[PDB]
């Protein structure tokens, strides 16, 4: 189960095809640069598919994290 209130909702309207809006994008990664699963992201097969796509681009442009060290264990 997940009781954290999906992303999307806590966000305005944006362009999923934008691989540069770090501030918005960033929002879809876990503590680790991991791309958040729909059960969290809050999008649709179609969105959640265009998201991941652009996220991967930003990463190549070195604007997003491929991975992150998990703080506190």
């Amino acid at each position: 189960p997940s009781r954290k209130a999906k992303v999307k909702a806590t966000l305005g309207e944006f362009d999923l095809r934008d691989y540069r809006n770090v501030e918005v994008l960033k929002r879809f990664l876990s503590e680790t640069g991991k791309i958040l699963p729909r059960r969290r992201t809050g999008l649709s097969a179609k969105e959640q598919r265009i998201l991941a796509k652009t996220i991967k681009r930003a990463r190549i442009l070195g604007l997003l994290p491929f991975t992150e060290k998990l703080v506190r264990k």
Partner: protein
């Protein structure tokens, strides 16, 4: 006698043993302990207990260099990993922040048979 004060303590949980390494503010080790170091041999080495003392035997060698605070970094899953983390805490040493950094690959090398039915 180089005096360190603050430092890094890397825990290396394996299912076979638990080396703990202490290093200066940015890499470069100082002292370290294992499971054999302390004394055990076979599967004994991995036992969470060993992991404890191991953290500890590495705790003293640390203070001797003048260690007070430490950034704990854990790697790999394993027995007593938490032990070590738990040790260092009650080691009289300052445990600044625990942080997991196990090396996971974005799938590249074929694993030994032993690690494939799992993959």
């Amino acid at each position: 006698k180089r005096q360190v004060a603050s430092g890094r303590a890397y825990i290396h949980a394996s299912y076979n043993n638990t080396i703990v390494t202490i290093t200066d503010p940015d890499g470069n080790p100082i002292t370290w302990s294992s499971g054999g170091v302390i004394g055990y041999k076979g599967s004994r080495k991995g036992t969470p207990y060993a992991a404890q003392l191991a953290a500890l035997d590495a705790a003293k060698k640390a203070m001797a260099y003048g260690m007070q605070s430490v950034d704990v970094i854990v790697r790999g899953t394993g027995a007593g990993r938490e032990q070590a983390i738990r040790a260092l805490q009650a080691s009289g040493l300052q445990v600044k922040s625990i942080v997991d950094d196990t090396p996971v690959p974005h799938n590249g090398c074929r694993p030994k048979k032993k690690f494939r039915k799992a993959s």
